[PDB]
């Protein structure tokens, strides 16, 4: 029963924790990040920051 109850759970998307960006909704700096080379290589990398305290999302490029 315990093993089944553990196996009925979904994938937990735990994101990298950092304390530099400031959220615009709750202003709690516990905002996760993800950065990649997605925009055209004529321009630098693109970062996307998501607040894990309120659900805010934004982009910096």
């Amino acid at each position: 029963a315990k093993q089944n109850l553990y196996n009925a759970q979904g994938a937990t998307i735990e994101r990298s924790v950092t304390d530099r960006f400031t959220c615009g909704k709750c202003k709690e700096k516990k905002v996760s990040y993800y950065q990649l080379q997605t925009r055209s290589a004529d321009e630098p990398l693109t970062t996307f920051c998501t607040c894990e305290a309120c659900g805010n999302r934004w982009k910096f490029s």
Binding site: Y34, T38, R39, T46
Partner: protein, 86 residues
């Protein structure tokens, strides 16, 4: 509100009249002008970011267990009204 006016702003009679007149004047100039072609404006507004959307579509590609359609293919399926989603 009355308490906000008397305690937070401390406006006089002259400033209050000025604020009311300015608010009415700035509101009356915000209505939309008849004759504007809003359809092409809306289409351009929606479809300009769609061009740049391709770059960052595959950020969800960074999560293998989150293989859910979003981005260009999802917008394509929404527009086509597809009867068989991925």
């Amino acid at each position: 509100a009355t308490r906000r006016v008397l305690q937070e702003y401390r406006l006089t009679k002259q400033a209050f009249d000025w604020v009311l007149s300015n608010i009415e004047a700035q509101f009356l100039r915000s209505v939309v002008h008849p004759g504007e072609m809003v359809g092409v404006l809306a289409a351009q507004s929606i479809g300009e970011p769609a061009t740049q959307m391709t770059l960052n579509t595959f950020h969800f590609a960074g999560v293998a267990s989150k293989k859910v359609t979003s981005g260009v293919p999802r917008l394509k399926e929404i527009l086509n009204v597809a009867k068989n989603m991925k």
